[PDB]
Amino acid sequence: TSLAQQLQRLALPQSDASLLSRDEVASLLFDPKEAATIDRDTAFAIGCTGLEELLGIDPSFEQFEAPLFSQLAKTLERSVQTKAVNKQLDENISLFLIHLSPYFLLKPAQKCLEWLIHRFHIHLYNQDSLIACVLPYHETRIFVRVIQLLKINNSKHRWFWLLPVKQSGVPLAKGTLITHCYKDLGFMDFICSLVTKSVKVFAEYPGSSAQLRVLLAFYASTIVSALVAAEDVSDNIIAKLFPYIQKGLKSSLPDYRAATYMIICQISVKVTMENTFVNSLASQIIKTLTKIPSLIKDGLSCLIVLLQRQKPESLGKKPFPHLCNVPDLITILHGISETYDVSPLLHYMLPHLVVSI
Amino acid sequence: RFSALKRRFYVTTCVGKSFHTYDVQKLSLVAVSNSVPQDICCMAADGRLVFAAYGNVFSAFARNKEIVHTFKGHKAEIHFLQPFGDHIISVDTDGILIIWHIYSEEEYLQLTFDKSVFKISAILHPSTYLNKILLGSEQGSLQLWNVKSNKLLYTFPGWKVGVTALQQAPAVDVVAIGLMSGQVIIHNIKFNETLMKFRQDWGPITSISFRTDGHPVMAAGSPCGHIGLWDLEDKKLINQMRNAHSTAIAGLTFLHREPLLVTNGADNALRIWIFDGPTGEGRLLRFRMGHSAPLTNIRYYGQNGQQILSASQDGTLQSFSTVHEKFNKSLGHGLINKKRVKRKGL
Amino acid sequence: NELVQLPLTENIPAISELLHTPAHVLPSAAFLCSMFVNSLLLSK
Amino acid sequence: ENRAKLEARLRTLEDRGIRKISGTGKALAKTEKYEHKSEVKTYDPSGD
Amino acid sequence: VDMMNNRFRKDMMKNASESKLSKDNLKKRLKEEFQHAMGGVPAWAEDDLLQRTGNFISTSTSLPRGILKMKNCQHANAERPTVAR
Contact call for E36 and D41, based on CB within 8 A: yes
Q: How far apart are CA A55 and CA A51, in angstroms?
A: 6
Give A1: exposed, middle or buried? Use CB within 10 Å, 0-12, 13-18, 19+: exposed
The answer to whether A51 and A64 are in contact (CB under 8 A) is yes
Contact D34 B24 (CB under 8 A): no
When scoring B1, B2, B175 by the number of chain D Cβ atoms within 10 A, the one with the most, hence best to mutate, is B2
CA separation for the pair A210, D44 (Å, rounded): 57
| CB–CB contact E31 B128 (8 Å) | yes
Q: What are phi and psi of B186, to 5 degrees?
A: -95, 115
Which residues on chain B are in Cβ contact (under 8 Å) with D35? none
In whole angstroms, give the CA distance from residue A300 to residue A311: 18
Residues on chain D bordering chain E, Cβ-to-Cβ distance under 8 angstroms: 41-44, 46-48
User: Which of A231, A242, A271 lies at the smallest CB-CB distance from E49?
Assistant: A242
3-class DSSP assignment, residue E82:
coil
Residues of B in contact with E44 (CB under 8 A): 195, 216, 232-233
Residue B126 to residues B129, B170, B189, D45, Cα–Cα distance (Å): 6, 11, 10, 8
DSSP state of B326: G
Contacts of A259 (CB under 8 A, 6+ apart): A216, A219, A220, A223, A248, C29, C33
3 state DSSP class of B262: strand
Q: How far is B26 from chain A (nearest CA, A)?
A: 18
Interchain pair A184, B236: CB under 8 A:
no
Q: Is A306 on the interface with C (CB under 8 A)?
A: no
Longest Cα–Cα distance of chain B, Å, equals 70
Cα atoms in the 13 Å half-sphere on the side-chain side of B227 = 28
Query: Which residues of chain D make contact with E38, given a CB cutoff of 8 A?
Result: 43
CB pairs under 8 A between B and D: 43
User: Residue B27 in contact with residue B255, Cβ under 8 Å?
Assistant: no
Q: Alpha carbon of C15 to those of A205, A268, A317, C25: distances in Å?
A: 33, 17, 35, 15
CB contact (8 A) between residue B256 and residue D37? no
β B78-84/B142-146 pair status: unpaired
Q: Which of B174, B170, B182, B167 is nearest to B237 (CA)?
A: B182
Give the number of beta-carbon pairs within 8 Å between B and E.
53
Tell me whether residues C37 and A265 touch, CB distance under 8 A.
Answer: yes
Closest CA to B105 of B51, B145, B148: B51
Contact B290/B301 with Cβ under 8 angstroms? no
The one-letter amino acid code at A47 reads: G
- For chains B and E, having 3+ Cβ pairs within 8 Å is answered yes
Alpha helix (H) residue ranges in chain B:
338-344
| Closest to A109 (Cα-Cα) out of A52, A147, A71 | A52
| D11 shares contact with chain A (CB less than 8 Å) | no
Contact predicate B31/B21, CB 8 Å: yes
**B168 closest CA partner among B125, B138, B198:** B125
Q: Are D29 and A177 inside 8 Å of each other by CB?
A: no
Interface with chain A: mutation pick from C4, C9, C40, C44, highest number of A CBs within 10 Å? C40
Closest CA to B210 of B187, B229, B188: B229
Nearest residue to B232 via CA among B159, B167, B166, B169? B169
Q: Spell out which residues of chain B touch residue D36, defining contact as CB-CB under 8 Å.
A: 24-25, 258, 260
Q: Does B278 sit within 8 Å of A184, measured CB to CB? A: yes
Return the ∠ at Cα A304 (arms to A300 and A308), rounded to 5°: 170
* Nearest chain A residue to E50, by CA: A239
Distance from CA of E29 to the nearest CA of D (A): 11
Partners of B57 in the β-ladder? B54
Q: From A344, A356, A282, select the one nearest A319 (Cα to Cα).
A: A282
Got the DSSP string for B24-77?
TTT--EEEEPPP-SS-EEEEEE-SS-EEEEETTEEEEEETTTEEEEEE---SS-
In sequence order, what are the residues at sequence separation of 6 or more whose Cβ sits closer than 8 angstroms to the Cβ of residue A353? none
- The answer to whether the CB of B266 falls within 8 A of the CB of B283 is no
Q: Which of A235, A242, A311 sits opposite E57 (nearest CB)?
A: A235
Please name every residue paired with B54 in a beta bridge, in sequence order, or none if there are none.
B40, B57
Dihedrals φ, ψ of A191, to 5°?
Answer: -65, -45
Technique of determination: cryo-EM
φ, ψ of residue A299 to 5 degrees: the values are -55, -45
Cα angle value A20/A26/A32 (rounded, 5°): 100
Q: Can you tell me whether residue A105 is helix, strand or coil?
A: coil
Cβ distance of D48 and B127 shorter than 8 Å: yes
Kindly calculate the radius of gyration of chain D based on its CA atoms and give it in whole angstroms: 29
Residue of B nearest to D48 (CA): B130
Cα A254 to Cα C36: distance, rounded to the nearest angstrom? 16
Residue of B nearest to E41 (CA): B171
Query: Per-residue DSSP letters for chain D?
Result: -HHHHHHHHHHHHHHHHHHHHH------PPP----PPPS-----GGG-
Cα distance from A214 to chain C (closest Cα, Å)?
Answer: 6
Sign of CA dihedral B111, B114, B120, B124: negative
Chains in contact with A, counting 3 or more C-beta pairs less than 8 Å apart as contact: B, C, D, E
Task: Name the A residues in 248-277 with CB < 8 Å from any E CB.
Answer: 271-274, 276-277
**Could you say which DSSP state residue A282 is in?**
H
Asked if D18 lies within 8 A of A183 by C-beta distance, the reply is no
**E50, E58, E66 member nearest A272 (Cβ):** E58
Interchain contact A189–E (C-beta under 8 A)? no
- Residue in A156, A159, A167, A190 to test binding to D, most D beta-carbons within 10 Å: A156
* Chains B and C touch each other (3 or more Cβ pairs < 8 A): no
**What is the separation of C-alpha B55 from the centre of its chain, rounded to a whole number of angstroms?**
19
| Facing B257 at nearest CB: one of D34, D37, D45 | D37
Contact B171 E23 (CB under 8 A): no
* CB distance B98 to B109 below 8 Å: yes
Q: Are strands B183-188 and B193-199 parallel, antiparallel or unpaired?
A: antiparallel
Q: Is B28 on the interface with D (CB under 8 A)?
A: no
List, in order, residues 6 or more apart from D30 with CB less than 8 Å away.
A155, A156
Contact state of B278 with A240 under an 8 Å Cβ cutoff: no
Chain E: give the shortest CA distance to residue A12, in Å.
Answer: 23
Cα–Cα distance for residue pair C13/C18, rounded to 1 Å: 9
Residue E71 phi/psi, 5-degree rounding, is: -135, 135
Contact yes or no for B126/B189 (Cβ under 8 A): yes
Q: How far apart are CA B253 and CA B259, in angstroms?
A: 11
CB contact under 8 A, B131 and D45: no
Residue A93 in 3-state DSSP?
Answer: helix
Report the C-alpha gap between A149 and A171 in whole angstroms: 14
Residue by residue, DSSP assigns A168-232 as S--PPPHHHHHHHHHH-HHHHHHHHHHHHHHHHHHTSSTT-TGGGHHHHHHHHHHHHHHHHH-SS
What is residue B247's three-state secondary structure?
Answer: coil
Specify whether the CB–CB gap between B186 and B176 falls below 8 A. yes
Distance CA(B111)–CA(B126), nearest Å, equals 20
3-state secondary structure of B107: strand
As a whole number of angstroms, the longest Cα–Cα distance in chain E is: 105
Instruction: Say whether A220 and C32 touch across the interface (CB within 8 A).
Output: yes
Closest Cα in chain A to D34 = A9
**D48, amino acid identity:** D
Among chain E residues, the shortest Cα distance to D40 is held by E37
Taking 3-state DSSP, the helix, strand and coil percentages for chain B, each rounded to the nearest 5, stand at 5, 50, 45
Interface test with chain C among A137, A249, A255, by most C beta carbons within 10 Å = A255
- Report yes or no: A214 at the C interface, CB cutoff 8 Å: yes
Question: D40–B285: do the CB atoms touch at under 8 Å?
Answer: no
Q: Does B198 contact E41 at a Cβ distance shorter than 8 Å?
A: no
Count the neighbouring beta carbons within 10 Å of the beta carbon of residue A307: 21
- Which of these, A191, A190, A240, lies nearest to A215 by C-alpha position? A191
* Residue E9 at interface with chain D, using a CB cutoff of 8 Å: yes
CA distance A324 to A345: 12
Buried b (16+ CB within 10 A) or exposed e, B97-107: bbbbebeeeee
> Which residue of chain A comes nearest to C26, CA vs CA?
A217
